[PDB]
Amino acid sequence: DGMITETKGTVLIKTAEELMNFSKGEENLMDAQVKAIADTGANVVVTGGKVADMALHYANKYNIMLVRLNSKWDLRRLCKTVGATALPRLTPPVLEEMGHCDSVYLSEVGDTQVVVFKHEKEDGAISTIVLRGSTDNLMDDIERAVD
Amino acid sequence: RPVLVLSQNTKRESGRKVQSGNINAAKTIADIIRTCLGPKSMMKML
Amino acid sequence: ASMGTLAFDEYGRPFLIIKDQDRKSRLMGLEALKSHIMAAKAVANTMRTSLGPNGLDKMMVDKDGDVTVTNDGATILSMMDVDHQIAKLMVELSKSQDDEIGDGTTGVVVLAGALLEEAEQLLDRGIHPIRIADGYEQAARVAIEHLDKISDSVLVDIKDTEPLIQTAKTTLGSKVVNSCHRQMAEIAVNAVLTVADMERRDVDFELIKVEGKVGGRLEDTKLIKGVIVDKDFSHPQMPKKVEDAKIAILTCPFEPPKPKTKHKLDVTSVEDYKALQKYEKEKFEEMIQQIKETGANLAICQWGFDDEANHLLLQNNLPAVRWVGGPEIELIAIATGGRIVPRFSELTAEKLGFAGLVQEISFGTTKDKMLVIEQCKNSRAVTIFIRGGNKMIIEEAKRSLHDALCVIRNLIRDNRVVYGGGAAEISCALAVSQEADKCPTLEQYAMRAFADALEVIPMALSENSGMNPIQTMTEVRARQVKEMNPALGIDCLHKGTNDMKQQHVIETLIGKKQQISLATQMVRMILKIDDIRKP
Amino acid sequence: GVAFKKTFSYAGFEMQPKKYHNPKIALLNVELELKAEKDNAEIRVHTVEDYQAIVDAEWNILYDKLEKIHHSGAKVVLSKLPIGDVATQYFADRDMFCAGRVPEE
Amino acid sequence: ASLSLAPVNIFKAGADEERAETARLTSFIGAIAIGDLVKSTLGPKGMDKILLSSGRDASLMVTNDGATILKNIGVDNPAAKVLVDMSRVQDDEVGDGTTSVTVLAAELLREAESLIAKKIHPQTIIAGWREATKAAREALLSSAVDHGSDEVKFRQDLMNIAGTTLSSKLLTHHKDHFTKLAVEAVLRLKGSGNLEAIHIIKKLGGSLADSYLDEGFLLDKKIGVNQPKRIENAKILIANTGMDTDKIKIFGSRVRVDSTAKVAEIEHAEKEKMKEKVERILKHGINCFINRQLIYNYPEQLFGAAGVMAIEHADFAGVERLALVTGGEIASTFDHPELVKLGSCKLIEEVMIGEDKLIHFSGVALGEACTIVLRGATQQILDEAERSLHDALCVLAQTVKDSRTVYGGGCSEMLMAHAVTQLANRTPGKEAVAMESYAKALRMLPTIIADNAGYDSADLVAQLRAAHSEGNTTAGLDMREGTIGDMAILGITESFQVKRQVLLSAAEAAEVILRVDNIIKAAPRK
Amino acid sequence: TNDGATILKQMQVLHPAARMLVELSKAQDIEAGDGTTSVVIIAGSLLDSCTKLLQKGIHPTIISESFQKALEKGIEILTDMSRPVELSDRETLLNSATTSLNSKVVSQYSSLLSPMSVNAVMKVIDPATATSVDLRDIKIVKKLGGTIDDCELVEGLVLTQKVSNSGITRVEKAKIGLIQFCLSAPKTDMDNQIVVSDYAQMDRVLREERAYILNLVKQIKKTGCNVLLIQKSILRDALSDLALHFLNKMKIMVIKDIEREDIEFICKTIGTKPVAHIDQFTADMLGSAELAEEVNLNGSGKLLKITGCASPGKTVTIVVRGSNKLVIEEAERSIHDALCVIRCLVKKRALIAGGGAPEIELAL
Amino acid sequence: LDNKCSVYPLTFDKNENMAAKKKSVAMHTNYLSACSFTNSDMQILTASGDGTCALWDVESGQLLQSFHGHGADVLCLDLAPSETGNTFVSGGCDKKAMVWDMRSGQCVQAFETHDINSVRYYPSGDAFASGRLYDLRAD
Amino acid sequence: PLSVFGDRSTGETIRSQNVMAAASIANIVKSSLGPVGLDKMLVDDIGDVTITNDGATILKLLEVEHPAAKVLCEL
Ligand SMILES: Nc1ncnc2c1ncn2[C@@H]1O[C@H](COP(=O)(O)OP(=O)(O)O)[C@@H](O)[C@H]1O
Ligand SMILES: Nc1ncnc2c1ncn2[C@@H]1O[C@H](COP(=O)(O)OP(=O)(O)O)[C@@H](O)[C@H]1O
Ligand SMILES: Nc1ncnc2c1ncn2[C@@H]1O[C@H](COP(=O)(O)OP(=O)(O)O)[C@@H](O)[C@H]1O
Ligand SMILES: [Mg+2]
Ligand SMILES: [Mg+2]
Ligand SMILES: [Mg+2]
Numbered sequence A: 001d002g003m004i005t006e007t008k009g010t011v012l013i014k015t016a017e018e019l020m021n022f023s024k025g026e027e028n029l030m031d032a033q034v035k036a037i038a039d040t041g042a043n044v045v046v047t048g049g050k051v052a053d054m055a056l057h058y059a060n061k062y063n064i065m066l067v068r069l070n071s072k073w074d075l076r077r078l079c080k081t082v083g084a085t086a087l088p089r090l091t092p093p094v095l096e097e098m099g100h101c102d103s104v105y106l107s108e109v110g111d112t113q114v115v116v117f118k119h120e121k122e123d124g125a126i127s128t129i130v131l132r133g134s135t136d137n138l139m140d141d142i143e144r145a146v147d
Numbered sequence B: 001r002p003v004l005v006l007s008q009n010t011k012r013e014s015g016r017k018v019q020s021g022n023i024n025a026a027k028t029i030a031d032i033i034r035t036c037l038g039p040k041s042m043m044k045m046l
Numbered sequence C: 001a002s003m004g005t006l007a008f009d010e011y012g013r014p015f016l017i018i019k020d021q022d023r024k025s026r027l028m029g030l031e032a033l034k035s036h037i038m039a040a041k042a043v044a045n046t047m048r049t050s051l052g053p054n055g056l057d058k059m060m061v062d063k064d065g066d067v068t069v070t071n072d073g074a075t076i077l078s079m080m081d082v083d084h085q086i087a088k089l090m091v092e093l094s095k096s097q098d099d100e101i102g103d104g105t106t107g108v109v110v111l112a113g114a115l116l117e118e119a120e121q122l123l124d125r126g127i128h129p130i131r132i133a134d135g136y137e138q139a140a141r142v143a144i145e146h147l148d149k150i151s152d153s154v155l156v157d158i159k160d161t162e163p164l165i166q167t168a169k170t171t172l173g174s175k176v177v178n179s180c181h182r183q184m185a186e187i188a189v190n191a192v193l194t195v196a197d198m199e200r201r202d203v204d205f206e207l208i209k210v211e212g213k214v215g216g217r218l219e220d221t222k223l224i225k226g227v228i229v230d231k232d233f234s235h236p237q238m239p240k241k242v243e244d245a246k247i248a249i250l251t252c253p254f255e256p257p258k259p260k261t262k263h264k265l266d267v268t269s270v271e272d273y274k275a276l277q278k279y280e281k282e283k284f285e286e287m288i289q290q291i292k293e294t295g296a297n298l299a300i301c302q303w304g305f306d307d308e309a310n311h312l313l314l315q316n317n318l319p320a321v322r323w324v325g326g327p328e329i330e331l332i333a334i335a336t337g338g339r340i341v342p343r344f345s346e347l348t349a350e351k352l353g354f355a356g357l358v359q360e361i362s363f364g365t366t367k368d369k370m371l372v373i374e375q376c377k378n379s380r381a382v383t384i385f386i387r388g389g390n391k392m393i394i395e396e397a398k399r400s401l402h403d404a405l406c407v408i409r410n411l412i413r414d415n416r417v418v419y420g421g422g423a424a425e426i427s428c429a430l431a432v433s434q435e436a437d438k439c440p441t442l443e444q445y446a447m448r449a450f451a452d453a454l455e456v457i458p459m460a461l462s463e464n465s466g467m468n469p470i471q472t473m474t475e476v477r478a479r480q481v482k483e484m485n486p487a488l489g490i491d492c493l494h495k496g497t498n499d500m501k502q503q504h505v506i507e508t509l510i511g512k513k514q515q516i517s518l519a520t521q522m523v524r525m526i527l528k529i530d531d532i533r534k535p
Numbered sequence D: 001g002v003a004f005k006k007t008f009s010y011a012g013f014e015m016q017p018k019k020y021h022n023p024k025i026a027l028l029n030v031e032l033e034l035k036a037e038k039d040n041a042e043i044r045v046h047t048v049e050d051y052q053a054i055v056d057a058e059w060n061i062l063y064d065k066l067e068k069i070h071h072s073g074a075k076v077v078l079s080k081l082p083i084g085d086v087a088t089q090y091f092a093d094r095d096m097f098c099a100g101r102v103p104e105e
Numbered sequence E: 001a002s003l004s005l006a007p008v009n010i011f012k013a014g015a016d017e018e019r020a021e022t023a024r025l026t027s028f029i030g031a032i033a034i035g036d037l038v039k040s041t042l043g044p045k046g047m048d049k050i051l052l053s054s055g056r057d058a059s060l061m062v063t064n065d066g067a068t069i070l071k072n073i074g075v076d077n078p079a080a081k082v083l084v085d086m087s088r089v090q091d092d093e094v095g096d097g098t099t100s101v102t103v104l105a106a107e108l109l110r111e112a113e114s115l116i117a118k119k120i121h122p123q124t125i126i127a128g129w130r131e132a133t134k135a136a137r138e139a140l141l142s143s144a145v146d147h148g149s150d151e152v153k154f155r156q157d158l159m160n161i162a163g164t165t166l167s168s169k170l171l172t173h174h175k176d177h178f179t180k181l182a183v184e185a186v187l188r189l190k191g192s193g194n195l196e197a198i199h200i201i202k203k204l205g206g207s208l209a210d211s212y213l214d215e216g217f218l219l220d221k222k223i224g225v226n227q228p229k230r231i232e233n234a235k236i237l238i239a240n241t242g243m244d245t246d247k248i249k250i251f252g253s254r255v256r257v258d259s260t261a262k263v264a265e266i267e268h269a270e271k272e273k274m275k276e277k278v279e280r281i282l283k284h285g286i287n288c289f290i291n292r293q294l295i296y297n298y299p300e301q302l303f304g305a306a307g308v309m310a311i312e313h314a315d316f317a318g319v320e321r322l323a324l325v326t327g328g329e330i331a332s333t334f335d336h337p338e339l340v341k342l343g344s345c346k347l348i349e350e351v352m353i354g355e356d357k358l359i360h361f362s363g364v365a366l367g368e369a370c371t372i373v374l375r376g377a378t379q380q381i382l383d384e385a386e387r388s389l390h391d392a393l394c395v396l397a398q399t400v401k402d403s404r405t406v407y408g409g410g411c412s413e414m415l416m417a418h419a420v421t422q423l424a425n426r427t428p429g430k431e432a433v434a435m436e437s438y439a440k441a442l443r444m445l446p447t448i449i450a451d452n453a454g455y456d457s458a459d460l461v462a463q464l465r466a467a468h469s470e471g472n473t474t475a476g477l478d479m480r481e482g483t484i485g486d487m488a489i490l491g492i493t494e495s496f497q498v499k500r501q502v503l504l505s506a507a508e509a510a511e512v513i514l515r516v517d518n519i520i521k522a523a524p525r526k
Numbered sequence F: 001t002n003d004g005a006t007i008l009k010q011m012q013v014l015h016p017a018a019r020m021l022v023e024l025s026k027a028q029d030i031e032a033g034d035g036t037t038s039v040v041i042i043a044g045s046l047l048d049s050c051t052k053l054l055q056k057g058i059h060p061t062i063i064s065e066s067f068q069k070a071l072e073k074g075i076e077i078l079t080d081m082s083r084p085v086e087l088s089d090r091e092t093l094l095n096s097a098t099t100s101l102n103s104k105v106v107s108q109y110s111s112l113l114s115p116m117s118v119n120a121v122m123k124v125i126d127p128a129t130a131t132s133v134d135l136r137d138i139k140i141v142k143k144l145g146g147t148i149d150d151c152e153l154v155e156g157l158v159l160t161q162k163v164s165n166s167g168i169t170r171v172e173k174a175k176i177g178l179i180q181f182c183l184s185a186p187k188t189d190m191d192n193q194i195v196v197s198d199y200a201q202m203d204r205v206l207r208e209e210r211a212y213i214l215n216l217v218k219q220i221k222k223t224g225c226n227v228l229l230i231q232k233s234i235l236r237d238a239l240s241d242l243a244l245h246f247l248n249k250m251k252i253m254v255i256k257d258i259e260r261e262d263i264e265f266i267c268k269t270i271g272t273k274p275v276a277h278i279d280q281f282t283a284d285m286l287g288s289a290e291l292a293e294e295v296n297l298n299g300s301g302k303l304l305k306i307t308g309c310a311s312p313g314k315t316v317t318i319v320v321r322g323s324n325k326l327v328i329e330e331a332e333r334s335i336h337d338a339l340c341v342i343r344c345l346v347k348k349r350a351l352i353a354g355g356g357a358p359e360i361e362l363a364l
Numbered sequence G: 001l002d003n004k005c006s007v008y009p010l011t012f013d014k015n016e017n018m019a020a021k022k023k024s025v026a027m028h029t030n031y032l033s034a035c036s037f038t039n040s041d042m043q044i045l046t047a048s049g050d051g052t053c054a055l056w057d058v059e060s061g062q063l064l065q066s067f068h069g070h071g072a073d074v075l076c077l078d079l080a081p082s083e084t085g086n087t088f089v090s091g092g093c094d095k096k097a098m099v100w101d102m103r104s105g106q107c108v109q110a111f112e113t114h115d116i117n118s119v120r121y122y123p124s125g126d127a128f129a130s131g132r133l134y135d136l137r138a139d
Numbered sequence H: 001p002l003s004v005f006g007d008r009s010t011g012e013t014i015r016s017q018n019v020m021a022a023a024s025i026a027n028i029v030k031s032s033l034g035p036v037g038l039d040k041m042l043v044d045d046i047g048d049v050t051i052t053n054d055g056a057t058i059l060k061l062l063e064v065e066h067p068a069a070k071v072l073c074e075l
Helices: A016-039 A053-061 A072-082 A136-146 B016-036 C029-050 C073-078 C085-100 C107-124 C129-150 C162-172 C176-194 C270-293 C307-315 C326-336 C391-413 C423-438 C441-454 C456-464 C469-482 C509-527 D048-071 D085-093 E020-038 E066-071 E078-093 E098-117 E122-143 E151-166 E170-187 E260-282 E297-306 E316-326 E379-401 E411-425 E430-451 E457-470 E496-514 F004-010 F016-031 F036-055 F060-081 F090-102 F110-123 F199-222 F241-249 F260-270 F325-347 F357-363 H012-029 H055-061 H067-074
Strands: A011-013 A044-047 A065-068 A103-109 A112-118 C057-061 C067-070 C208-212 C222-224 C227-229 C241-250 C263-267 C298-300 C353-362 C369-374 C382-386 C416-419 C506-508 D025-028 D041-045 D076-079 D097-099 E016-018 E049-052 E060-063 E198-204 E217-219 E231-239 E253-257 E288-291 E309-311 E343-353 E356-364 E370-376 E404-407 E475-478 E483-486 E493-495 E516-521 F138-144 F152-154 F157-159 F170-172 F175-179 F192-194 F227-231 F253-258 F287-296 F302-309 F316-322 G043-047 G053-057 G063-067 G088-091 G097-101 G106-111 G119-121 G127-130 G133-135 H040-043 H049-052
Touching: A011 A016, A016 A053, A016 D048, A072 A112, C029 C073, C029 C085, C029 C107, C029 C456, C029 C509, C029 E516, C057 C073, C057 E078, C067 C073, C067 C391, C067 E078, C073 C085, C073 C107, C085 C107, C085 C509, C107 C129, C107 C441, C107 C456, C107 C509, C129 C416, C129 C423, C129 C441, C129 C509, C162 C176, C162 C391, C162 C506, C176 C222, C176 C382, C176 C391, C208 C227, C208 C391, C227 C326, C227 C382, C241 C326, C263 C270, C263 D048, C270 C307, C270 D048, C270 E260, C326 C353, C326 C369, C382 C391, C391 C506, C391 C509, C391 E078, C391 E496, C416 C423, C416 C509, C423 C441, C423 C456, C423 C469, C441 C456, C456 C469, C506 C509, D041 D048, D048 D085, D085 D097, E016 E020, E020 E066, E020 E078, E020 E098, E020 E516, E049 E066, E060 E066, E060 E379, E060 F016, E066 E078, E066 E098, E078 E098, E078 E496, E098 E122, E098 E430, E098 E496, E122 E404, E122 E411, E122 E430, E122 E496, E151 E170, E151 E379, E151 E493, E170 E370, E170 E379, E198 E379, E198 F016, E217 E316, E217 E370, E231 E316, E253 E260, E260 E297, E260 F192, E260 F199, E288 E316, E297 E309, E316 E343, E316 E356, E370 E379, E379 E493, E379 E496, E379 F016, E404 E411, E404 E496, E411 E430, E411 E457, E411 E475, E430 E457, E430 E475, E457 E475, E457 E483, E493 E496, E496 E516, F004 F016, F004 F036, F016 F036, F036 F060, F060 F357, F090 F110, F090 F325, F110 F152, F110 F316, F110 F325, F138 F325, F157 F260, F157 F316, F175 F260, F199 F241, F227 F260, F241 F253, F253 F260, F260 F302, F316 F325, G088 G119, H012 H055, H012 H067, H040 H055, H049 H055, H055 H067
Parallel strands: A011 D041, A044 A065, C057 E516, C208 C382, C241 C298, C263 D041, C263 E253, D025 D076, D076 D097, E198 E370, E231 E288, E253 F192, E288 E309, F138 F316, F175 F227, F227 F253
Antiparallel strands: A103 A112, C057 C067, C222 C382, C227 C369, C241 C353, C353 C369, C416 C506, E016 E516, E049 E060, E217 E356, E231 E343, E343 E356, E404 E493, E475 E483, F152 F316, F157 F302, F170 F287, F175 F287, F287 F302, G043 G053, G053 G063, G088 G097, G097 G106, G119 G127, G127 G133, H040 H049
């Protein structure tokens, strides 16, 4: 989303033209930022915070996959496994900071819906074991064995 | 109104716990008067 | 057999499986079915005395002490404070019949009770309940096909409302408004026919406003081809009657404009104060002059207004009414043919509605005034103004008129009718019995039980009318078999004839089909339950 | 296709036609009603003409959104956000259909 | 099986249902108890009750009105609730007849109980009662007499109607004085039905005969400080403006300056604005000024300096009544003096009534608004006098609206009962029995009227029945001594609307209650 | 108390008949002001007779009609046995007041209160034209301390408010002015704030506020006013401390927190026209008075007395003092009874003998 | 025992800092169900156990209008969105919430679908919390 | 329906309950069978101690309230 001041924000409107142009200019700024991000070649965007409606709309317009990760541990692990740097602002990423994954898709395993960042090489920083089972307790025991 | 095959106040204990408890009880009874043996024994007040 | 299971293990150590298992209950097997059948039979037998023209009302009292004297089955069961789950299923069945059809909400309960009562004796002979449900479904299919076969079609034209009037009269015959029977049927038919899409499309009940007010007599209930508003002219000195009124519908309060956004207007000098005062005065004068320029004779607002606007409206011979509700604004706009204008600057002559007469109505020694808008050109909205001697008959008249409107709506959807008075049920029972003879023996019992259950409606009508149930039903069935006439029913009103076609006892085919279908499905659902686990 | 329940229509909804033979549907996520421009917005004016201009500007913002929707050729307007009475009457005047607060699914 | 007498329990805790015997018994007991309670307050010799509230205030109220008696009681029987609501609706529709309708409904339900005991289906009773009601209504309509054409005869009818309405109330002590009072008050309305235009002022002290109708109008407000206390040939200007700290309706407006000199300038501008407002008001050339809302100190002193009497805080009713009595226009803007009509009266002054000071308008222009002063020895006496006048005024207004009149003193009841009996004698079946019970209730009404007087009710009712069967259609009870007499000669008349409403409402409510065969109660909240 | 109305009101009677007797007593107090106990006793005796009448088998309506006839005859008898009076006959008024005061606790002081009550009633009405007396024109002030012998009739105005000024407590040849606005910093009805952006604006604000207050005080003083009454104000400080300082430096007594309900009484008493805006404050709206001083009641409080006015228009004040609060309240009630009796004489110019003579004659 | 609050801030002892003008009308006594101060501090709305909403003026101290029509006592009441003629709701024990307007002194709108004790206007003003949500524009 | 002042169990419930009671009684004494069986020690809630292996004695000392278990005890 469009970053705001950390002190306090107050849209000071003094003329009718400012009132009629504020929202339009804000939307145009969001569109420009999203298009700038997309023009680098990025096609998957992962954010640690909330997703604004206008930002989501403009990401959908430019065919960009959006994944939101609440935990910062997950964000750092994703950066490790993909090779990307967590940008602090919404600037487009430079060539060194854009991580690459050989396949990202939405899938359903059993009942739960999952998002998979899948490589094809037999390497990488992080490897994941998907544990199946008929009971939560059984999977917990298998996880203890894996540990 | 429980079924109560046995009476409500009936308690059952079985297994290794029973044997350990019996042997520990005997050991405790022995330890009560362990020191009251021999010419140099000490008296007790009851 | 109750409370579930209790063993505490064969080794004496505790054996607890379900939380609070010692505080819960469990019914299993056949006795659960018997309890459910007994509860449903109790509900149906309570309801069956209110079936037919000679039905008797039930006086329902809620938790607050308010009294509701009514004959509608769905209302009675809705206000009934039940704890048994099967009784709740009966209540939901009545609500379903009311929602889908609007009439016959009492017949479904009696039919379901009869079906479960027969299923009881079928179960006592060792028949699996699923077999009973399957036989009931088969017999219901046969009965529905027979209803389609013996159905009759009526004309739903606006130039001949006699069959529609007869159907509405049949619907209203069991209600307290049977004193004004023909007038009630007339107004219901006219209301439905006025607001309806003629290509057999839907009837929007939001375009029918049912309004009640105490006083007067029940015969004073009338259909008004306009809108009756619970408001009055804002200024007490405004004229109480406007004729050929050019109506301006507005949703902007007659006040100085106010931005929605957080706004502060700064007054920094005496000249600023004078300019602000002049701006206020000029906005008031300008809005009134803009209303006047369109040629309007009457203004309706939704959000009220203040003293300056009130006196300006009075000074310019512009009668006005304020604080009219949103739905009433919509109804007035629809009836008068005028659009809804959100602000004065957008108000033009072509957006004005037209009403042949706008009047303020008093109600005796009550100080209450209610506005009337009528004599519209081609009004597509109606209002039923119900009078009476007490609030209770007013509510009962409201629901009876709703039943009549629903029946005419069903006729609009499908114009096939079946003669009532128990004739349809008797013919269906005969058809089911005939089809049961060809059936293999095992489902024959279920089909015969279904026919016997269908026989309950004429028996209930006979006992409510004081006649002997079994003798009358047997004679009518014999006459139906002897001569090909599926219109012979129970002479509840003692008119001297058993033919419901001359008696003009008319029921919609959709209503009977829905009754049979819903009763069969609920009976199957209850028959399929064999376990109860209340806390 | 898709079917869903009617969602709390406002005044003037019953004047909208309830059948179309080849409609174009505008699926929006937009609040079409007069409201504060932004939560932290704050208007400061010191002149009555500026006051009237601000009021007309709010109205013109709403009407500009509505005109943009109407000129698209759509006949059915569906929104995830509330659609006000003003927008409902505006669409009724154009023989359009509107339904706000549609569930996201 | 029954919903309650079944092995499985189908109800919540506290839910209860009452089948045929119990439902009919409860309905009949409740209705008969209500009828017995409200009766004995019927007819010229009826008595009054005492209503002791059990609340914190413990309000005390003595009254003869049936509707007020039934309204302020703790009723839990649902049929009694039906009868109470019927009485309230009867009061709303017309002023009088609240006791008669309740007594008639109770008697009808008692006859219904007897018929049910005689093994008669309630549907048959209802059909017979519907036919009887139709016959009785037709007879009553055929017996109505209209005098609205002749002025003197109509005034005599108004006199008789007011007297008959007041005869049963506490005002019967000064019936003649109060009858003149009420008829004059109603006739001053000039045909308008606005009963709110008649204001009743209850002032303690003095005798009941001291009550009077002011020839002009009386207001219970106050005059400003420096303003005159007496105006001759007043020129009224009735207004509904703010006239107090009058703030601009621009609600976001504020004063944001950089010095206190500017704040003082703005304050002077506001004061000058109010002064200009007062100057615009005064440009109408007025002597008096009534405002609905408050008048603060600055406009008050401006009016005082102008020598104009300003009356503040006269509520909506006050300004409406002043406009009706003086002909002024309730104005809220003063940019057009020539387009606003001014009220007028010969004199305005302050008068003492008891220990309170009131503003008196004398020689009013229109006068289509009355003030009635009520003096009494106790508060309860004052309240009952106000209720009695309300009944009389309502009946007189109805008679003005519809001039058809029927004879009272049981004459109408005898006539309707005779018509019902004639219909029943030609009707076969148990419907004849139901019709006869209907006639029995109708005759039981004047029976109770005579019983309340200690007279020989049976003999008088038999004489009335014989006279009405013979053809003496105007015979009725003569309560002066206890014989029968000519109601036309004796001048006991009643509004046809009131009697028709009593008949129709009583029959309808009896039919509604009779149709009930089961009473089901949800679990109470408390 | 000895007053019947007060006795019946204070004791919470629960039977409805007793409640209606209380209401009857209130009505008699309203219409006459005396005989409040006698009317209740008469009603009780009448109903006591009705007991035997009902037991003899007489319908209540007959009893009521006969009682009405008896009442009409009794009114005729009482009117016949009375004699006319003239308001110029002071002896009759004094005797009526004394007879009113005989039954009350202030009976040894009747020699002081009866002429006091007669003077109070005569001073607030026009004897040649008055047809009723508005007792609200007579103000009664209760101050603890002293003895009922110290009760005083003040021909001017008595205010319980305290003088804001210290050192100015006695003004001769006073020119009282009544103010309904506030002497504080300017404040408009609309929302107002002063925005400061420079350091100079701070002391400019201070100086301009001081100048505004000083101009208000100078305009007030220019009219010759020396005693100032300020109406009680809310939402705005009626009297700023700086305004009080300026007024004190100009030798003007200041009394504030004047109640709104008392404005009419004050204006009627001392002939002052209230002023709501400083522009209209002129000399012609001042009320000239002979002396306005604050007296001390021997350590039992202070009173502001304005005695001697150029236009003493139909208004008098009574100061009631006593040893303890109960006797003061009873003295106030008794003085009110005496005033009500003189009011009765004003309304109906007819005098009748007392001591049970009307009752004995009526019974016979 | 039961009170333990007789020494409440009634004293209001300060250095006379312009806040001492608390008015404290309390003329009607009875029970002060809701002493809410109007957004414009000119007026006070008070509800009593008799079921009548009362409007008072702080300056004059006089009862402007007594709003009657509620079935039972009004337990709670609110204020207008900002001022808007103070179109205020009133929730009581009669299960009904209704809106009043002093420009006419009448119950402009009414709602009955629930005792209401937690009324609160929406910031826009088109609705209000009914602790539910009633829409002004659709009734 | 029955209106019997008591509790009723019918069908598989009562059969399984009886089997459970009999199984509990059997499990009480199943551990005192054969040469490798072990004796039990019964405390009689007043301090009396009975050490025994005989099945009849164990079943007589125990207080039982389920009638099928009583049947096995008398057996
Ligand atoms: N005049 C009549 N003669 C004979 N039967 C009638 C007559 N009017 C209605 N009925 C029958 O009474 C039955 C009950 O109708 P009613 O009580 O009005 O609604 P519901 O079907 O909900 O009970 C209907 O099945 C109808 O066939
Ligand atoms: N002077 C009279 N003589 C005979 N009958 C009277 C007289 N006045 C009233 N009535 C009768 O008394 C009946 C009851 O009227 P009333 O007791 O005043 O109260 P309500 O009209 O509310 O029942 C009326 O039907 C009327 O006919
Ligand atoms: N000095 C007196 N001698 C004889 N009778 C007196 C005397 N003073 C008062 N009365 C009588 O005492 C009665 C009661 O008077 P009082 O107690 O003063 O007031 P109230 O009449 O209200 O009780 C009066 O009727 C009066 O006639
Ligand atoms: Mg029906
Ligand atoms: Mg009467
Ligand atoms: Mg005395």
